[PDB]
Amino acid sequence: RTLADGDRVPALVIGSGYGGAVAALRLTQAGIPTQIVEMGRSWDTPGSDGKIFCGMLNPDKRSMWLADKTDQPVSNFMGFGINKSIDRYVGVLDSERFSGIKVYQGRGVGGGSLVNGGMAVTPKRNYFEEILPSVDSNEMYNKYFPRANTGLGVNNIDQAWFESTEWYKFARTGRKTAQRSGFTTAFVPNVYDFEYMKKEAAGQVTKSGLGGEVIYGNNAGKKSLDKTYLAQAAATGKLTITTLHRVTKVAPATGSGYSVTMEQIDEQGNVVATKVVTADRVFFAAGSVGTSKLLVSMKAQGHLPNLSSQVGEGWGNNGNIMVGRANHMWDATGSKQATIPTMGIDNWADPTAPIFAEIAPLPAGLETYVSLYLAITKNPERARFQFNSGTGKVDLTWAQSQNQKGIDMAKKVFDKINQKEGTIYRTDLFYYKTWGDDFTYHPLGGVLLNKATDNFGRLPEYPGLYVVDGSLVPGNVGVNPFVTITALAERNMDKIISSDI
Ligand SMILES: Cc1cc2nc3c(=O)[nH]c(=O)nc-3n(C[C@H](O)[C@H](O)[C@H](O)COP(=O)(O)OP(=O)(O)OC[C@H]3O[C@@H](n4cnc5c(N)ncnc54)[C@H](O)[C@@H]3O)c2cc1C
Numbered sequence: 228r229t230l231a232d233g234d235r236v237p238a239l240v241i242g243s244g245y246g247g248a249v250a251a252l253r254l255t256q257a258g259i260p261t262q263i264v265e266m267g268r269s270w271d272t273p274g275s276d277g278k279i280f281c282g283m284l285n286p287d288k289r290s291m292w293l294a295d296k297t298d299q300p301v302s303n304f305m306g307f308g309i310n311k312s313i314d315r316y317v318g319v320l321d322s323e324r325f326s327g328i329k330v331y332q333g334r335g336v337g338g339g340s341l342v343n344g345g346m347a348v349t350p351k352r353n354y355f356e357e358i359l360p361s362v363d364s365n366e367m368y369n370k371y372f373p374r375a376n377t378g379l380g381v382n383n384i385d386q387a388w389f390e391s392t393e394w395y396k397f398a399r400t401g402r403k404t405a406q407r408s409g410f411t412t413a414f415v416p417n418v419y420d421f422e423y424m425k426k427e428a429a430g431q432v433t434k435s436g437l438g439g440e441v442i443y444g445n446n447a448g449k450k451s452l453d454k455t456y457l458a459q460a461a462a463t464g465k466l467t468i469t470t471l472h473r474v475t476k477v478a479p480a481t482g483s484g485y486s487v488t489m490e491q492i493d494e495q496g497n498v499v500a501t502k503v504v505t506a507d508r509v510f511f512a513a514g515s516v517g518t519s520k521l522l523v524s525m526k527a528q529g530h531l532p533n534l535s536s537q538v539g540e541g542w543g544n545n546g547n548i549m550v551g552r553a554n555h556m557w558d559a560t561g562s563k564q565a566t567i568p569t570m571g572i573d574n575w576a577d578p579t580a581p582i583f584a585e586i587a588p589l590p591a592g593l594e595t596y597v598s599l600y601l602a603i604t605k606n607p608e609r610a611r612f613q614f615n616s617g618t619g620k621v622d623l624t625w626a627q628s629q630n631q632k633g634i635d636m637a638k639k640v641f642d643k644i645n646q647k648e649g650t651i652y653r654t655d656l657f658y659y660k661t662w663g664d665d666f667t668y669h670p671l672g673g674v675l676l677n678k679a680t681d682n683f684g685r686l687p688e689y690p691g692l693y694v695v696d697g698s699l700v701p702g703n704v705g706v707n708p709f710v711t712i713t714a715l716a717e718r719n720m721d722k723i724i725s726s727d728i
């Protein structure tokens with residue numbers, strides 16, 4: 228059963244996304260009874276319509292975390308994406324507003340794996356060696372990265388099927404125009420079962436990726452963490468998952484261990500109870516934003532006053548920038564679009580315009596002629612979290628203007644394709660904005676490896692406290708982050724379990 232006030236637990240993992248799922252798997256396999264505390268719900272119970280998740284075409288209360296309206300980056304575009312009113316509910320996608328950026332995050336058992344596009348990319352070794360020089364890259368490349376990819380269930384699309392299917396016409400068009408401008412394109416591996424997708428196209432199985440589902444969950448096909456790491460962790464019989472509990476405070480307990488305060492909420496987000504449990508070891512896996520907010524609050528409120536001054540520093544947005552281009556009539560993108568991106572434009576090696584851009588679907592169900600892109604740029608800008616005395620809240624200092632360096636990098640590539648194709652940008656996808664620069668899907672940093680923590684995620688001032696999630700990464704990895712977070716967690720857990728436990 229779930230955690231009760233007064234309980235004493237060997238290992239408590241806060242959060243159940245990538246870092247938390249790796250921690251839980253490795254701890255329980257080591258034979259350590261482990262409690263995961265997750266603020267969202269378990270997504271294994273059908274809603275009204277008999278399905279677990281809602282699709283993007285007709286979202287309902289299941290879409291958003293405690294909100295009165297849906298929120299998608301593309302709004303009111305040709306019948307698609309219009310924000311509708313919903314009941315407040317513990318829905319799957321949180322659009323967390325800070326002053327200069329909104330951070331999209333998954334909420335529920337599996338964290339971001341529930342809502343993400345499944346793109347599983349291993350960073351370039353050269354860049355990896357440069358941004359994380361304290362990490363033994365041989366171990367990462369010979370062992371931890373492969374371990375992560377295999378554990379996550381990464382697979383590749385059948386390229387012959389890709390070429391023929393109407394569902395990926397948008398990607399073929401995006402590839403064609405990138406290549407005509409001299410840019411390199413690459414297939415991108417994914418945790419979505421591509422064999423299942425072929426059956427979807429054949430009309431043989433329930434459509435998910437071919438049925439307008441992704442950011443509010445996938446009823447089928449996508450290997451979210453509850454199907455991989457967490458299923459394996461639960462299989463040991465040593466895992467307990469406590470859902471609908473938000474951790475609010477961590478402080479040294481008397482005698483040993485740490486007191487963990489949590490708010491139990493009902494499905495409407497009302498706090499129904501407050502509990503305190505004592506844990507010998509605590510693994511922060513609440514995500515780049517969640518972990519940073521917790522540690523910054525704990526330090527500023529005098530609960531963990533000895534934390535490093537580096538706590539809260541070095542947050543980045545993985546240089547996320549979105550943009551859409553108009554194609555001419557002969558470069559249709561298709562009325563049937565898979566929701567799972569499979570193709571990227573890799574220009575990272577170009578020091579003048581270092582970007583990796585995925586060709587994203589805009590599944591509106593009609594021909595829009597739009598090529599949509601999500602670009603990861605090598606934006607050097609960073610921000611920090613800081614506790615605000617007046618409000619009792621943690622603020623993020625990121626300013627929207629800090630995205631300008633990323634836009635300039637992206638522009639260099641997209642302007643070149645626009646010149647070759649004689650096309651213009653769309654300005655109606657995001658308030659007459661061309662560049663989608665006020666949100667990120669990829670928050671990274673805040674509690675940097677070997678800066679705020681030791682070289683393995685330990686908080687040295689408080690033995691037994693560990694950080695295992697995206698807050699460790701220095702703001703940008705040059706590709707979709709989850710494979711990196713998983714592999715880094717794999718590395719750290721290996722050392723912690725072998726050294727500390
Ligand atoms: C819409 C979307 C699309 C994306 N697409 C891709 C993609 O295709 N490929 C890729 O590599 N990455 C992608 N990402 C990013 C990827 O999902 C994240 O990098 C990744 O999930 C971060 O892992 P994490 O373990 O750090 O934290 P998360 O996965 O964010 O998990 C944090 C967990 O902790 C829980 N939590 C938070 N605070 C508390 C608290 N105080 N108490 C209890 N529980 C708490 C949260 O509810 C959540 O379940 C995308 C993200 C989104 C949101």
Ligand SMILES: C[C@]12CC[C@H](O)CC1=CC[C@@H]1[C@@H]2CC[C@]2(C)C(=O)CC[C@@H]12
Nearest residue numbers: 299300301343344345441566587588601
């Ligand atoms: C690119 C991304 C977000 C990144 C994911 O990995 C894949 C993905 C699929 C559908 C896209 C979404 C961005 C926002 C979009 C464009 C919408 O608003 C509806 C469809 C959505």
